[PDB]
Design an enzyme around this catalytic site. Sequence first.
Site, PDB file in Angstrom:
ATOM      1  N   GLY A 183       4.023  -0.283  53.283  1.00 28.33           N
ATOM      2  CA  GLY A 183       5.315  -0.142  53.940  1.00 28.33           C
ATOM      3  C   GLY A 183       5.519   1.229  54.557  1.00 28.33           C
ATOM      4  CB  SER A 184       8.615   3.227  54.940  1.00 26.56           C
ATOM      5  OG  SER A 184       9.337   2.004  54.904  1.00 26.56           O
ATOM      6  CB  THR A 185       4.207   5.202  51.831  1.00 28.82           C
ATOM      7  OG1 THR A 185       3.414   4.005  51.765  1.00 28.82           O
ATOM      8  CG2 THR A 185       5.317   5.168  50.777  1.00 28.82           C
ATOM      9  CB  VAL A 186       1.146   4.027  56.182  1.00 25.90           C
ATOM     10  CG1 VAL A 186       0.407   3.896  54.865  1.00 25.90           C
ATOM     11  CG2 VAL A 186       1.746   2.729  56.553  1.00 25.90           C
ATOM     12  CE  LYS A 187       8.900   3.204  59.024  1.00 29.08           C
ATOM     13  NZ  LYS A 187      10.092   2.864  58.250  1.00 29.08           N
TER      14      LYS A 187
END
Length: 463
Positions: free
Chosen positions: A216-220
Amino acid sequence: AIPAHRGLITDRNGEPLAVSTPVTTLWANPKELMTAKERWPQLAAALGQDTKLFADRIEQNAEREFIYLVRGLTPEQGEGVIALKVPGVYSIEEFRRFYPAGEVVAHAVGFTDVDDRGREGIELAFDEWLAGVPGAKPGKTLALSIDLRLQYLAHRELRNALLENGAKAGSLVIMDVKTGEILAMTNQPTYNPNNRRNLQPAAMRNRAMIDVFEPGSTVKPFSMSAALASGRWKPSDIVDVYPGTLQIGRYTIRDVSRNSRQLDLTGILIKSSNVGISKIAFDIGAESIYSVMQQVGLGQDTGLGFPGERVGNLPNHRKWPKAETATLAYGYGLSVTAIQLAHAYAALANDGKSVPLSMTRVDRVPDGVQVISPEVASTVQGMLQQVVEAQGGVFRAQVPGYHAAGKSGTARAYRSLFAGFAPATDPRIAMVVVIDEPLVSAPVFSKVMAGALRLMNVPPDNL
Ligand SMILES: *C(=O)N1C[C@H](NOS(=O)(=O)O)CC[C@H]1C(N)=O
């Protein structure tokens, strides 16, 4: 076969984690035992074995010449037995493993089988180094990269957090961004390797290495690294995300906080806007984003040779439509482990240089690969520091005394994620917190990171 003393496993500072301890095994020649057969009940009794069950075994193995009576007694329990002078009942001097830190480091250390052969974790992964050859020369001492102080701190704080948010499972990874060392790797639930006659298979799971999830958003931050390396995006550039939704043919991308119009690139991370990251992803193309993610190790082999360790999947579509382009950029078109995610954040924290993962003490640091340019990595570092410091940011992840950087996310059954590193101006530690669930984990990052940096005498940078 004269069994060999097994190499001592310590932590990075010499604290004992697996100790080969001498035990006495009593074995017996059945043929010789049929001779002293009025002695069986006394032998059976002193072995804790039922007289008729004991007699049945001996009678059953009447052909054979070697059977075990009991393995692993202390040297004066076996001393008491052979002191009963039973014909055909001898001695073999073995070694049993004891795990002084117990369940605190269970998954990392692993354990041996009944024959002192590595069966899980480090005990298996380094079995040849640790074993040495039977007769008989002894195995070799191994210092893990684990810091038992940081491990215990992570273990204690993670278990508390599960008790707070009513959660069952979870994991926490601490890494030295400079050396590649895994300083702490703790799973909940865990188990006592000294008493594994009675341990559920769910508590055996090394979740940090086995449990695979869409991050999810942790690889943004990595999607954003691709953006800054393309040359089409500077940090102060603007994306319009109004009204928090974005139609992709049939699919509709939807933000969690739909309260913005124009966001600069840091704003997209602070508010964690899927709309903004997708729009950027369309502009730069998914190939660039796949490349950064693969280069930092997401969905790649960690190369630890750890038993059970899983790789996940970063699919290389070679050409991506718009929907798969966006779903990759905000982290649902790939699957990773907690260990891969921490290694990736390590690379970002180490000015874009990825040092290879190590579960053993690193004395001579191998040269890393510049996988993200140092300018881009330092820029994304500043943005992630703003995700924690700034107004509307993840304030519960702030670390008193230091500047911390990081990113929350929801993994996918869901898991709460926080990934970050500290201190923001000369990073030393990357940490990933995973709490399974039916900003839970940003407080745990805060507590565990505050202690870890202090245990490592890292001077405060918030001055
Ligand atoms: C990231 O995991 N997501 C995007 C968005 N970010 O919020 S967060 O900062 O609490 O992680 C909402 C959760 C998730 C998603 N469902 O797309």
